[PDB]
Amino acid sequence: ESADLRALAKHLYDSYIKSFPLTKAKARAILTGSPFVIYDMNSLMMGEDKIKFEVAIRIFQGCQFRSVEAVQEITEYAKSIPGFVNLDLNDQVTLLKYGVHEIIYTMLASLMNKDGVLISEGQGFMTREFLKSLRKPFGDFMEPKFEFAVKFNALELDDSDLAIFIAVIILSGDRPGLLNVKPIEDIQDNLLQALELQLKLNHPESSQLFAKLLQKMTDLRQIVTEHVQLLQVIKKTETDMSLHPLLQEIYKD
Amino acid sequence: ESADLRALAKHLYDSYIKSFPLTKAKARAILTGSPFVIYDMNSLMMGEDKIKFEVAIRIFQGCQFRSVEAVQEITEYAKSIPGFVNLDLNDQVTLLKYGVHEIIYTMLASLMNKDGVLISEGQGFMTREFLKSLRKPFGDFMEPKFEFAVKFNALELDDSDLAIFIAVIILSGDRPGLLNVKPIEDIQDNLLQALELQLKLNHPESSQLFAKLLQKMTDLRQIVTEHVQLLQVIKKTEHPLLQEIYKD
Numbered sequence: 001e002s003a004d005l006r007a008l009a010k011h012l013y014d015s016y017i018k019s020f021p022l023t024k025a026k027a028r029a030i031l032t033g034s035p036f037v038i039y040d041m042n043s044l045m046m047g048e049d050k051i052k053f054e055v056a057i058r059i060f061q062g063c064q065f066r067s068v069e070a071v072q073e074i075t076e077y078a079k080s081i082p083g084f085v086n087l088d089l090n091d092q093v094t095l096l097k098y099g100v101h102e103i104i105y106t107m108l109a110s111l112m113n114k115d116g117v118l119i120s121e122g123q124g125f126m127t128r129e130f131l132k133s134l135r136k137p138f139g140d141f142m143e144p145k146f147e148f149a150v151k152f153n154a155l156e157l158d159d160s161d162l163a164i165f166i167a168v169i170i171l172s173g174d175r176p177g178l179l180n181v182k183p184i185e186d187i188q189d190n191l192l193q194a195l196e197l198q199l200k201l202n203h204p205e206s207s208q209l210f211a212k213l214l215q216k217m218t219d220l221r222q223i224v225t226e227h228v229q230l231l232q233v234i235k236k237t238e239t240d241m242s243l244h245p246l247l248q249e250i251y252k253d
Numbered sequence: 254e255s256a257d258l259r260a261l262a263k264h265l266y267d268s269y270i271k272s273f274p275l276t277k278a279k280a281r282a283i284l285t286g287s288p289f290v291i292y293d294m295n296s297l298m299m300g301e302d303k304i305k306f307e308v309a310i311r312i313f314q315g316c317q318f319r320s321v322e323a324v325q326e327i328t329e330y331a332k333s334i335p336g337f338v339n340l341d342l343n344d345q346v347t348l349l350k351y352g353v354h355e356i357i358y359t360m361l362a363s364l365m366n367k368d369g370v371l372i373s374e375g376q377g378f379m380t381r382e383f384l385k386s387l388r389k390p391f392g393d394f395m396e397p398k399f400e401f402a403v404k405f406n407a408l409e410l411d412d413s414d415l416a417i418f419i420a421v422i423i424l425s426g427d428r429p430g431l432l433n434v435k436p437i438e439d440i441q442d443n444l445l446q447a448l449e450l451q452l453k454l455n456h457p458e459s460s461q462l463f464a465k466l467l468q469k470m471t472d473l474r475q476i477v478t479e480h481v482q483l484l485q486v487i488k489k490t491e492h493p494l495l496q497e498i499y500k501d
């Protein structure tokens with residue numbers, strides 16, 4: 001019934017808000033009028049001065065601490081998902097391990113636009129161009145991200161929505177490795193039931209948004225494909241580049 | 254008013270039974286009289302077959318999948334406490350962060366008698382001799398909780414008593430880091446009233462029990478303070494996706 005779903009639809013908005021500190025609603029406020037903009041190496045060097053923190057490497061090692069903290073938050077988010085904790089532990093570690101990345105770039109879209117990305121909690125902004133002109137093996141780690149973000153941000157989801165979506169992701173069940181898929185799918189069938197109603201109410205003028213949302217996992221899967229191969233080359237150029245251990249468990253290529 | 258506190262007493266009970274799968278008055282059957290028994294080593298190995306799930310580790314670590322389950326049941330429980338939802342979201346988390354250990358051991362005492370403890374929904378019973386019979390630091394990890402519990406069930410508390418008492422623990426305004434303490438206490442001084450009443454109609458003979466209860470969070474907060482140091486010794490004994498699920 002409507003009531004049982006609307007209620008789960010709030011339970012999740014609540015956990016999302018407690019577990020994620022830069023929300024899409026907060027990000028958009030910073031981006032629609034303040035951050036320090038970074039566009040060349042001269043501003044970036046003024047940028048160590050201005051905002052809390054070779055050129056492309058200690059950028060990259062910084063983009064990956066931010067992902068380590070984001071895996072930390074995703075986990076905390078996922079526990080609050082009704083039913084998740086009540087699942088074979090090998091699955092909880094597998095739903096987590098594959099469903100992180102798909103979520104990072106969903107939520108990373110909340111910090112992007114046509115022109116750039118907000119770094120370092122909001123304090124800074126990195127132009128799309130500084131990113132698209134970096135060292136040969138680093139200068140496109142974030143390019144396809146931007147093109148998804150603009151495709152994605154188009155749907156104009158907000159946080160009440162993203163929070164059920166972020167949940168439909170985690171609870172996949174089409175994941176490689178899972179033992180007991182039937183309870184995973186049985187949970188997600190409820191999220192999907194929840195999400196469908198959320199969209200029809202928060203965005204009632206957005207025809208086939210549910211359908212058009214669900215389709216973005218196709219775009220989303222592809223993005224992570226491109227990422228693991230891209231990371232594989234940097235572990236061959238920079239065999240001196242150390243990756244974080246938490247991030248390494250998520251990489252069974 | 255006197256009739257409202259009887260309303261709230263019901264409200265929280267119905268919430269309790271819903272939010273909490275295994276209730277004391279339920280497990281009470283399993284203890285007195287059926288479940289497996291784990292008296293020594295060969296029974297324990299025989300235990301992974303029937304109740305599907307180093308050896309003394311595979312034990313404690315598993316007491317923690319159940320904690321993490323239990324924090325959710327408490328979380329979904331707290332939200333039925335009138336005006337709990339209405340608090341500053343920051344305070345909600347803080348009340349729950351600190352409240353959960355104190356509320357876990359209270360329920361760990363409805364799964365204990367003198368002789369051991371129920372496990373995995375009560376399809377098991379681990380002999381306290383066996384839990385005593387563990388390598389250090391493990392054999393007396395669960396032994397000070399055994400001492401608290403018989404002291405605690407001594408009051409002969411039922412589930413509706415625990416339902417108000419559980420709420421009262423969460424709404425404790427002395428938690429470090431609260432922002433707007435007044436409405437928290439407003440609810441606790443309400444539940445406290447409600448708990449006083451319930452304790453009389455349900456134990457009219459039990460004498461000054463309300464008082465002997467509030468004297469136990471003296472013991473609850475002292476187990477917790479001491480339990481959590483045992484967790485930091487374990488951080489000097491003994492995949493990273495797991496440790497993240499199971500942060501203290």
Ligand SMILES: Cc1c(C)n(Cc2ccc(-c3ccccc3C(=O)O)cc2)c2ccc(C(=O)N[C@@H](C)c3ccc([N+](=O)[O-])cc3)cc12
Binds near residue numbers: 022058060063122
């Ligand atoms: C390129 C880059 C730098 C240099 N920093 C700051 C930083 C970070 C770490 C370190 C560092 C790392 C290891 C060891 C030492 C240091 C060190 O220099 O101290 C240095 C600089 C970033 C912070 C966030 C993002 C980002 O992608 N934004 C999203 C993900 C986001 C933005 C904001 C939020 N948010 O929660 O608000 C979530 C996601 C990118 C960068």
Ligand SMILES: Cc1c(C)n(Cc2ccc(-c3ccccc3C(=O)O)cc2)c2ccc(C(=O)N[C@@H](C)c3ccc([N+](=O)[O-])cc3)cc12
Binds near residue numbers: 311
């Ligand atoms: C030592 C131990 C083991 C091995 N299991 C089973 C188990 C269960 C899960 C996992 C596990 C964990 C993480 C990831 C995967 C797995 C996995 O199994 O693979 C491993 C072993 C236990 C279950 C309960 C308790 C206990 O003290 N009782 C409390 C908790 C209780 C008593 C009564 C009730 N109740 O109300 O019914 C609840 C809890 C102790 C143990």
Ligand SMILES: *c1ccc([N+](=O)[O-])cc1C(=O)Nc1ccncc1
Binds near residue numbers: 063064067070
């Ligand atoms: C950028 C580059 C590399 C990695 N990584 O090693 O996994 C991650 C990122 C990144 O952008 N992470 C992130 C995106 C959005 N929000 C937070 C973190």
Ligand SMILES: *c1ccc([N+](=O)[O-])cc1C(=O)Nc1ccncc1
Binds near residue numbers: 316323357358360
């Ligand atoms: C067992 C082992 C460690 C901890 N802890 O880190 O606080 C807790 C427990 C435990 O007894 N958990 C439990 C809670 C509620 N119901 C049943 C079991």
